[PDB]
């Protein structure tokens, strides 16, 4: 008959992204998803491209990528797409993971768990990257952050020691972080593939949370039009940075070759990384502050189990809804802090929206949940 | 120390989201890196070649090469040689190392000026009130001797001696040499020898800006058409 | 397709035994080694034949190589 | 209409479609590249080296 | 017989050849006035 | 029909232009950067070389001779053995002026 | 019921590897396939390791290498290992090759050409890899080989040089083979994954060339043993190279740093481009040869055309065996003249063996089914 | 014998490998190759018969 | 720059400065470096030995 249907690779992509039903109310949230492969695309690319180029000599590495950016054809715009990309993948990372929360989209465990992992395999990924120019930030950055594991007891020295291939992060450290960097996003879209894969077994959930099946619609064309604009918002967006303000987003710090002797007055990670970089700096004790900062991400893990509302989604779920824009807020706070100095009144700010973060997703919006259930006879 | 003075916002010709960097600006800026600063401050990643096409002609730039010594690779009998600059040649060195720039700059190291606009906060902002920004102590101050007072250098104590005074060199173009039109051109040289692209990035800019303009409603309406189906549709529950 | 609808199949007895109730190798050279000889004689007057002429067209064309090199009188 | 004329003249049959398609994109990149220079090398007068170098 | 009767994709395939002809000298950047005509 | 395929048609030209750029862009990058551009030529003076006389220079990393030749050496060379040359080919194609000769400083053998 | 026939990636698994009905009499013949599946995981894990040391700066390059052999912990074991990995690689392509041509495995056309792709893919690998230590053979090889691109009229020159990224093989050429050496393995991998997604329709044939429909058994475990005995011997074998006889397969020149100065007595490639290298050096003219070069290759592509016999496997056709194995000595003998100098007598045997080679594909073999036929009566 | 040893420095280390990987493998392989017969012995053994009305 | 004495952690000196030097001075020849040499010469110890003695 038909060879779309048939045809053994032909089948998957009609199954997959043209016959596919989709809920009909589906909001702009639901682009992300889409916008995050393009993300993933983007960066490998642009990746492929400067690593035709770039060097991973603690030597060479920094003017390599300067390099890039003066002598190579085109090479500035390639390199500042792959950094700006990098924070655009960021922002639709959060985005996507914000659908998920506000819409109950978590209770598909496994296409969810999928997904932290994703989470922290593209964190894996931008934090080794960013260490491969051989700046500043770069380098200190990476040293302050991997000594975190030196907190782990018994083997937290040996452990941190052997990640470097030596005493300090050195010529070793940055060749190893350059494989990694390269290999991982390869992981990463298999893992997405087989994200996507669970995800198939339900279909999508919709702003409702109501299931859809008497509302579906064939993806294509709905869908393949609408996803189609999101990726120009995403490139209006991502080439405005480029070619207005590729600096926007970054530090200047990461300017000035990497020097072991003289340390950069403020030591930050990149902005995506802030929420939790000010959570770890809240606590005192540098283990605790360690295990505060690994569940800061890995409580995405358990919030599947933190729900009590009958109702799937927030839409109608009111009390919810204002604690969910808390949170949002809360890490907006949990960012600026991170990105400050560890003075007064930061310090104390800091220890105020660490302990919020934590008391919203693990007691105020489970007791909403039930609240609400009382106030509707359930 | 541990204070303020951030710089305020001067209006430079290129801050604009479409203005270009004014080329005649940096062909002055780069006179004054070459006369004043170039003893003390390296710039490794300019070459002769890269003033090209951007304030010197192909020839201009191959005189100013050739007025320089530079070494080059063994020869028949395996010696170094020193020979004049070519428009393949970097910049040069003022000194052989770091500890060589420290030990003549009382324990001071000069920072490479390839970047220098785009590694501090402020820029050209920040640069061009460091330069312009020296004075006097405040009662109550004082610094060790050798480093000068600045408001707007961390700590406010510099190491550097203000560099740029009236006529402190000759313009090709016969500008007026006074202290604020040397700050303002050689940080508008130091802007571009940080981002050379600036201009061909902000031609770019205008292009996107324009093809979105055209294709972000153009989409718009193809998606409104396709589900124009969808919005249009009425339901109709009908039991028996 | 898998098992269960492969193919039809009509009056054919398999009888089999569990590998616990059996050797290994049941007359492992007796009836092998004889299987092996059968095996190669099959093949040998289809398969031998070309690598014999490579390895003559080998000697062959390794030694006329040491021959051009050398001189002759003349 | 003109949308008419276009439609039966160039969009109906496929193949046609494309050969627009290709052709006026042609037009237009020459079209768009010259008149957007134009417009930023106005809005940038003097301050180009392809504005100075005639005095080198 | 009814192919040759066919062959009705011989003017579609000749439109499609302008396609691929011109589809490859627009990616790759004379004798057209005005595109190139005046690089 | 007319106007709502306009939309399309055009949009894919805008599309395909940006995606020309896109896409020659990440080409030439791929290109001889300008670095290694600036040592595609060399510039030699040649009235700073004696008649007879080779003066070596270094070319892509490699000795490049430049040869002043003599009245002895053009004629010389001129009515050499046509044909019989192990890698036949006559001088007055082998160079653009008969008193300069311009050859890769590397035996072609080993 | 049972989770192995359920759960959505499970069931992909059982599907393909523990209940897949394969043929009860497939020879050691189809031990090759999962051989190749290891050769490539194994360059994966080992090349990985060695990326993480390595550096492709000309001037560090050929050093880091012998660094890793000398100062990196084992890391002398890991570089062999990728080296004969290389060569094992190659064995089991050939074998694998040897199969399908024998048993007919080439009439699952899509299977098939997938297969010719994988077989490219792993040749432009291998052809990357060998030049980025940069000794006189990577170097000189590269070289010689990439300027055949040259004999194309119009575009020769102009292709070639934009590949390389200059005027010769040098940094920027290193640097870009590097990068395609990396990401290489994982489109192998994919293209591998639909390889056996098209197999998957239709099974596996078997030695008789006739359908197995009525005897077929369950993958595992009788095919789960055999395959692991088969990689048992695979790891004997790169085991016995790599501990006993690390170079035997290779070319010492490639011991002496890259040279542009200095052209080596004889450039050769590795050994598997050996008939291929033989077949182009037969040709006078250049682009001839490298037509030649790319037909010896590309004709993979046409062995399903030129079948004429009425069996599928060659396993009854007496005249069709003898030509094969005349074609398997004709590779032999076009390797050994590869790996030797342009003079007599291998100028002319050469030239015999590259006639002989497409003779027996294109008019012996296709001539000997169509006699077999008559033979029997149809 | 140190112009080898500077080429080669693990050839001590190697050749020692090499045994252990020679007696390994001596064990290891008519170990798995009696594992393959044992679950293969099944079909090996099996008898058939035709049996038609 | 200064001189010192060698320690464990330094290479095996360079008898010249560069191979330009090497090749003044042995009549134009540059002595191959000795690393590798019995890994990049066929024969290996067999050639080298009977090279030395030959
Ligand atoms: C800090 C970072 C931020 C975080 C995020 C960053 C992450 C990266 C980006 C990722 C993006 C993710 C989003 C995915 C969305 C994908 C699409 C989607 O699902 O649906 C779209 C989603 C809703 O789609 P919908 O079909 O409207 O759904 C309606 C609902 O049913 C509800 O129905 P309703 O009837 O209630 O709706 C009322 C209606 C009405 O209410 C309004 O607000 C009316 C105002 C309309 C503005 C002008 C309309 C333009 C064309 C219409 C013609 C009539 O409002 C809307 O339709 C809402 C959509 C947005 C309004 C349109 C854009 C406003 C811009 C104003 C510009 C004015 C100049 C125009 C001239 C253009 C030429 C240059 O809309 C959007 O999100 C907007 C996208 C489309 C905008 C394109 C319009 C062109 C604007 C000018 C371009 C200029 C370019 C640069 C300068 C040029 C120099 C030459
Ligand atoms: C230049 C490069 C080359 C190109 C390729 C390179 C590519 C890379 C490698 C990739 C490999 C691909 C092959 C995949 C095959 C996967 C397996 C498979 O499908 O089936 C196996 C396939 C056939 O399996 P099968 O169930 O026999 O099928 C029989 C057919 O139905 C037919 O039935 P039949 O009854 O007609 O058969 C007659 C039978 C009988 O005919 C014979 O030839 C009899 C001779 C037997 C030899 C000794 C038997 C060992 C254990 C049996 C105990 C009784 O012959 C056979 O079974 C044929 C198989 C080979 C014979 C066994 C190995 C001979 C080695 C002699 C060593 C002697 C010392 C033994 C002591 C061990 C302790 C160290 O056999 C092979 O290909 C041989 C693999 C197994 C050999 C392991 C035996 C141990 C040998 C000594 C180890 C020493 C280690 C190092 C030194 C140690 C120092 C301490
Ligand atoms: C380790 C991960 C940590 C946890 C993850 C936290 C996620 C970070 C947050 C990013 C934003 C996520 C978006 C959440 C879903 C949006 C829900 C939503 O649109 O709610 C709207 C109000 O919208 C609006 O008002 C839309 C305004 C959008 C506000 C912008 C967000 C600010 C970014 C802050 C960055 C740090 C009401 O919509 P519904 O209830 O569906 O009802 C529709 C009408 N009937
Ligand atoms: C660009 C690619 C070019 C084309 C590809 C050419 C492939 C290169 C060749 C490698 C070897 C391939 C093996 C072919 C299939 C083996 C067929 C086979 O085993 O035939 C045997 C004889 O075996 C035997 O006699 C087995 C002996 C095996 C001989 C070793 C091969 C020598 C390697 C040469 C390397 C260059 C007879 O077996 P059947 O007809 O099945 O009958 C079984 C008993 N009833
Ligand atoms: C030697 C006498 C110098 C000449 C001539 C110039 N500079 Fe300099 N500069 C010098 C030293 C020793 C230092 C380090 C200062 C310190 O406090 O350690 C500097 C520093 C700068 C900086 C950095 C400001 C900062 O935030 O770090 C800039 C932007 C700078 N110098 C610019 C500059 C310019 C534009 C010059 C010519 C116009 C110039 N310098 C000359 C020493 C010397
Ligand atoms: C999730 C996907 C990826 C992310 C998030 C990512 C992120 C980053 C980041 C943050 C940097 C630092 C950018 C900078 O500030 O300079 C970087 C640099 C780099 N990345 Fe990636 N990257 C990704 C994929 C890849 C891939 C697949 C490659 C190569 C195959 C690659 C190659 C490089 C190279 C060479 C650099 C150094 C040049 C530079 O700094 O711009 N990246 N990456
Ligand atoms: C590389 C990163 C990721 C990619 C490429 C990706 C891809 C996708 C795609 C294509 C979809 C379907 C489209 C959509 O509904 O938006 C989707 C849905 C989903 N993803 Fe992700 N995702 C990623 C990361 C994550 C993360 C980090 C989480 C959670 C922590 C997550 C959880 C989900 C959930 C729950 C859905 C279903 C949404 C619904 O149907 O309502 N994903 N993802
Ligand atoms: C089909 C898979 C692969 C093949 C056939 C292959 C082949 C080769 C070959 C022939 C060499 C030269 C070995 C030598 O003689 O020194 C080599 C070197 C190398 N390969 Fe691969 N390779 C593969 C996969 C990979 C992967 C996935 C990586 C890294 C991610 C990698 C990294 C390297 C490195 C760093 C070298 C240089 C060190 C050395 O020469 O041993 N390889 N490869
Ligand atoms: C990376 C390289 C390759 C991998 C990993 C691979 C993998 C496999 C695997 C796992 C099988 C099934 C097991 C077997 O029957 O041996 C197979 C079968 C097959 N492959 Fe490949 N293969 C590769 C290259 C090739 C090439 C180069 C060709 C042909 C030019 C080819 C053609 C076939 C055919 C025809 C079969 C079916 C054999 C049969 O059932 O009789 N493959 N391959
Ligand atoms: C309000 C009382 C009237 C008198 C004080 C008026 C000043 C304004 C109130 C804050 C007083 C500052 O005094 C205090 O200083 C410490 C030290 O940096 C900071 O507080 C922090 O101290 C350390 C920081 O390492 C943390 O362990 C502690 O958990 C946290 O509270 C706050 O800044 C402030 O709580
Ligand atoms: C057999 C006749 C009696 C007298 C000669 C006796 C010597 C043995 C026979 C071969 C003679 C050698 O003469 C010949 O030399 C040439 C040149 O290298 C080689 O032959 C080759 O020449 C060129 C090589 O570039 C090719 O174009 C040509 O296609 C090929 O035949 C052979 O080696 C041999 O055919
Ligand atoms: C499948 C799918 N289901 C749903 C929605 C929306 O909700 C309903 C379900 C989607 O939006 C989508 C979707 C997902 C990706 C996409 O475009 C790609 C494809 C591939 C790609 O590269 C990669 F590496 F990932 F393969 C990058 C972008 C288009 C559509
Ligand atoms: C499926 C399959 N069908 C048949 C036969 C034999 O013929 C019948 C059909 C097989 O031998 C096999 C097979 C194939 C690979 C394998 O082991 C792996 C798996 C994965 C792997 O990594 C990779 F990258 F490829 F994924 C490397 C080796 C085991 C078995
Ligand atoms: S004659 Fe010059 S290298 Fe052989």
Redesign the pocket.
Same mark, same amino acid.
């Given at each position: 008959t038909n060879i779309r249907k048939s045809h053994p690779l032909m089948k998957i992509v009609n199954n997959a992204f043209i016959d596919l039903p989709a809920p009909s109310n589906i909001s702009?949230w639901w682009?992300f998803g889409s $916008?995050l492969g393009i993300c993933l695309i983007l960066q490998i690319l642009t990746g492929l491209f400067l690593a035709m180029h770039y060097t991973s000599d603690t030597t060479t590495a920094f003017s390599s990528v300067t390099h890039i950016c003066r002598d190579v054809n085109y090479g500035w715009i390639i390199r500042y797409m792959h950094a700006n990309g990098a924070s655009?993948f960021f922002?639709?990372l959060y985005?996507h993971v914000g659908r998920g929360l506000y819409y109950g989209s978590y209770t598909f465990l496994e296409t969810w768990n999928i997904g932290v992992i994703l989470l922290l395999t593209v964190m894996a990924t931008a934090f080794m990257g960013y260490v491969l120019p051989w700046g500043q930030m770069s380098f200190w950055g990476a040293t302050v952050i991997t000594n975190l594991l030196s907190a782990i007891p018994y083997i937290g020295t040996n452990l941190v020691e052997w990640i470097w291939g030596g005493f300090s992060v050195d010529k070793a450290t940055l060749t190893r972080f350059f494989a990694f960097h390269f290999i991982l996003p390869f992981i990463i879209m298999a893992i997405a593939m087989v994200h996507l894969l669970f995800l198939h077994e339900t279909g999508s959930n919709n702003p409702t949370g109501i299931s859809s099946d008497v509302d579906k619609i064939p993806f294509h064309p709905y869908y393949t039009i609408?996803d189609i604009?999101?990726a120009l918002? $995403?490139i $209006?967006?991502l080439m405005l940075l480029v070619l207005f303000a590729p600096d926007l987003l970054g530090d200047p710090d990461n300017y000035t070759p990497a020097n072991p002797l003289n340390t950069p007055p403020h030591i930050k990670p990149e902005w995506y990384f802030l929420f939790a970089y000010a959570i770890l700096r809240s606590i005192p004790n540098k283990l605790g502050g360690v295990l505060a900062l690994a569940f800061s991400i890995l409580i995405l893990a358990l919030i599947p189990l933190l729900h009590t509302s009958k109702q799937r989604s927030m839409m109608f779920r009111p009390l919810s809804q204002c604690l969910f824009w808390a949170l949002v807020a809360d890490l907006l706070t949990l960012t600026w802090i991170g990105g400050q100095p560890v003075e007064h009144p930061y310090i104390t700010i800091g220890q105020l929206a660490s302990v919020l973060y934590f008391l919203l997703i693990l007691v105020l919006m489970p007791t909403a949940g039930t609240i609400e259930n009382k106030l509707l006879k359930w | 120390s541990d204070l303020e003075l951030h710089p305020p916002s001067y209006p430079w010709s290129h801050r604009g989201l479409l203005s270009s960097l004014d080329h005649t600006s940096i062909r002055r800026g780069f006179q004054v890196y070459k006369q004043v600063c170039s003893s003390c401050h390296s710039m490794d990643y300019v070459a002769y070649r890269h003033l090209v096409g951007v304030c010197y002609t192909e020839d201009e730039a191959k005189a100013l090469a050739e007025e320089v010594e530079v070494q080059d690779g063994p020869n028949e009998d395996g010696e170094m040689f020193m020979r004049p600059g070519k428009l393949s040649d970097y910049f040069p060195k003022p000194y052989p190392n770091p500890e060589a720039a420290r030990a003549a700059n009382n324990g001071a190291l000069p920072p490479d000026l390839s970047y220098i606009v785009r590694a501090r906060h402020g820029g050209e902002d920040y640069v061009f009130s460091l330069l312009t920004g020296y004075c006097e102590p405040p009662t109550g101050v004082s610094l060790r001797e050798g480093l000068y007072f600045n408001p707007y250098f961390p700590g406010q104590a510099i190491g550097m001696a203000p560099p740029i005074y009236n006529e402190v060199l000759e313009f090709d173009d016969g500008t007026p040499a006074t202290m604020s039109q040397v700050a303002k051109d050689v940080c508008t040289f130091l802007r571009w020898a940080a981002e050379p692209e600036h201009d061909h990035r902000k031609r770019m800019g205008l292009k996107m #800006? #324009?093809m979105?303009?055209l294709l #972000?409603?153009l989409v718009?309406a193809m +998606?409104?058409h396709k589900?124009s189906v969808l +919005?249009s549709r009425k339901l109709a529950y009908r039991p028996p | 397709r898998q098992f269960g609808h492969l193919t039809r199949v009509r009056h054919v007895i398999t009888y089999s035994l569990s590998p616990f109730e059996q050797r290994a190798f049941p007359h492992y050279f007796s009836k092998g080694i004889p299987n092996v000889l059968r095996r190669t004689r099959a093949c040998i007057l289809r398969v031998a034949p070309p690598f014999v002429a490579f390895y003559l067209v080998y000697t062959w064309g390794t030694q006329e190589f040491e021959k051009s090199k050398r001189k002759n009188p003349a | 209409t003109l949308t008419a004329r276009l439609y039966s003249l160039l969009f109906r049959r496929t193949s046609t479609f494309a050969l627009t398609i290709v052709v006026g994109a042609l037009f237009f990149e020459r079209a768009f590249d010259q008149g957007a220079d134009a417009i930023y090398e106005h809005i940038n007068e003097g301050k180009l080296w392809k504005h100075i170098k005639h005095k080198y | 017989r009814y192919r040759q009767l066919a062959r009705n994709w011989v003017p579609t395939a000749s439109l499609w050849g302008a396609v691929g002809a011109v589809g490859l000298v627009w990616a790759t950047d004379d004798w057209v006035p005005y595109i190139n005509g005046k690089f | 029909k007319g106007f709502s395929y306009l939309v399309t048609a055009t949009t894919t030209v805008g599309v395909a232009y940006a995606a020309k750029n896109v896409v020659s862009q990440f080409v030439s990058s791929m290109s001889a950067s300008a670095d290694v551009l600036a040592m595609s030529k060399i510039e030699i003076k040649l009235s700073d070389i004696p008649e007879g006389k080779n003066m070596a220079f270094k070319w892509r990393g490699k000795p490049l001779f430049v040869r002043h030749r003599t009245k002895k050496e053009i004629d010389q060379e001129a009515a050499v053995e046509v044909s019989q040359l192990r890698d036949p080919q006559h001088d007055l194609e082998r160079v653009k002026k008969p008193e300069w000769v311009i050859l890769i400083g590397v035996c072609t053998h080993l």
């Amino acid at each position: 008959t038909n060879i779309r249907k048939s045809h053994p690779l032909m089948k998957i992509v009609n199954n997959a992204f043209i016959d596919l039903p989709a809920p009909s109310n589906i909001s702009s949230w639901w682009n992300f998803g889409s $916008l995050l492969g393009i993300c993933l695309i983007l960066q490998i690319l642009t990746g492929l491209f400067l690593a035709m180029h770039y060097t991973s000599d603690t030597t060479t590495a920094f003017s390599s990528v300067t390099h890039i950016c003066r002598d190579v054809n085109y090479g500035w715009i390639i390199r500042y797409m792959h950094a700006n990309g990098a924070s655009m993948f960021f922002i639709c990372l959060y985005m996507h993971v914000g659908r998920g929360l506000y819409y109950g989209s978590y209770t598909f465990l496994e296409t969810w768990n999928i997904g932290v992992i994703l989470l922290l395999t593209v964190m894996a990924t931008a934090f080794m990257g960013y260490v491969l120019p051989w700046g500043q930030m770069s380098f200190w950055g990476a040293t302050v952050i991997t000594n975190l594991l030196s907190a782990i007891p018994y083997i937290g020295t040996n452990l941190v020691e052997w990640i470097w291939g030596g005493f300090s992060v050195d010529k070793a450290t940055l060749t190893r972080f350059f494989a990694f960097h390269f290999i991982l996003p390869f992981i990463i879209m298999a893992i997405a593939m087989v994200h996507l894969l669970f995800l198939h077994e339900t279909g999508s959930n919709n702003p409702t949370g109501i299931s859809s099946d008497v509302d579906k619609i064939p993806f294509h064309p709905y869908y393949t039009i609408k996803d189609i604009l999101g990726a120009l918002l $995403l490139i $209006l967006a991502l080439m405005l940075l480029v070619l207005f303000a590729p600096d926007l987003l970054g530090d200047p710090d990461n300017y000035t070759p990497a020097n072991p002797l003289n340390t950069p007055p403020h030591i930050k990670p990149e902005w995506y990384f802030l929420f939790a970089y000010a959570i770890l700096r809240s606590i005192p004790n540098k283990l605790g502050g360690v295990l505060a900062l690994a569940f800061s991400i890995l409580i995405l893990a358990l919030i599947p189990l933190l729900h009590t509302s009958k109702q799937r989604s927030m839409m109608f779920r009111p009390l919810s809804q204002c604690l969910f824009w808390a949170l949002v807020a809360d890490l907006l706070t949990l960012t600026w802090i991170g990105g400050q100095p560890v003075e007064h009144p930061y310090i104390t700010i800091g220890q105020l929206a660490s302990v919020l973060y934590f008391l919203l997703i693990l007691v105020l919006m489970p007791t909403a949940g039930t609240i609400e259930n009382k106030l509707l006879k359930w | 120390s541990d204070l303020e003075l951030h710089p305020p916002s001067y209006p430079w010709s290129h801050r604009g989201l479409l203005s270009s960097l004014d080329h005649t600006s940096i062909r002055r800026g780069f006179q004054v890196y070459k006369q004043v600063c170039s003893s003390c401050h390296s710039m490794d990643y300019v070459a002769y070649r890269h003033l090209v096409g951007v304030c010197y002609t192909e020839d201009e730039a191959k005189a100013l090469a050739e007025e320089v010594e530079v070494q080059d690779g063994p020869n028949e009998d395996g010696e170094m040689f020193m020979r004049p600059g070519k428009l393949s040649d970097y910049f040069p060195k003022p000194y052989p190392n770091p500890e060589a720039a420290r030990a003549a700059n009382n324990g001071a190291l000069p920072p490479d000026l390839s970047y220098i606009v785009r590694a501090r906060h402020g820029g050209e902002d920040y640069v061009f009130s460091l330069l312009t920004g020296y004075c006097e102590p405040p009662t109550g101050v004082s610094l060790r001797e050798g480093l000068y007072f600045n408001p707007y250098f961390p700590g406010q104590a510099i190491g550097m001696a203000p560099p740029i005074y009236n006529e402190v060199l000759e313009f090709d173009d016969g500008t007026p040499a006074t202290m604020s039109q040397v700050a303002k051109d050689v940080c508008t040289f130091l802007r571009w020898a940080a981002e050379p692209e600036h201009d061909h990035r902000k031609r770019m800019g205008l292009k996107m #800006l #324009l093809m979105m303009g055209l294709l #972000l409603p153009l989409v718009y309406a193809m +998606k409104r058409h396709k589900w124009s189906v969808l +919005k249009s549709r009425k339901l109709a529950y009908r039991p028996p | 397709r898998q098992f269960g609808h492969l193919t039809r199949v009509r009056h054919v007895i398999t009888y089999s035994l569990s590998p616990f109730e059996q050797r290994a190798f049941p007359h492992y050279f007796s009836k092998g080694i004889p299987n092996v000889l059968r095996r190669t004689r099959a093949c040998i007057l289809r398969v031998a034949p070309p690598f014999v002429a490579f390895y003559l067209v080998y000697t062959w064309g390794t030694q006329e190589f040491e021959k051009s090199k050398r001189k002759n009188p003349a | 209409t003109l949308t008419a004329r276009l439609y039966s003249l160039l969009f109906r049959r496929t193949s046609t479609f494309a050969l627009t398609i290709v052709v006026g994109a042609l037009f237009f990149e020459r079209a768009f590249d010259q008149g957007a220079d134009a417009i930023y090398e106005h809005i940038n007068e003097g301050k180009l080296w392809k504005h100075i170098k005639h005095k080198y | 017989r009814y192919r040759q009767l066919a062959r009705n994709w011989v003017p579609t395939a000749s439109l499609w050849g302008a396609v691929g002809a011109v589809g490859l000298v627009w990616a790759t950047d004379d004798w057209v006035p005005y595109i190139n005509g005046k690089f | 029909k007319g106007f709502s395929y306009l939309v399309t048609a055009t949009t894919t030209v805008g599309v395909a232009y940006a995606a020309k750029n896109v896409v020659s862009q990440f080409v030439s990058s791929m290109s001889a950067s300008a670095d290694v551009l600036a040592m595609s030529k060399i510039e030699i003076k040649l009235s700073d070389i004696p008649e007879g006389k080779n003066m070596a220079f270094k070319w892509r990393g490699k000795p490049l001779f430049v040869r002043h030749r003599t009245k002895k050496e053009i004629d010389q060379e001129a009515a050499v053995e046509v044909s019989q040359l192990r890698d036949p080919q006559h001088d007055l194609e082998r160079v653009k002026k008969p008193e300069w000769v311009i050859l890769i400083g590397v035996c072609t053998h080993l």
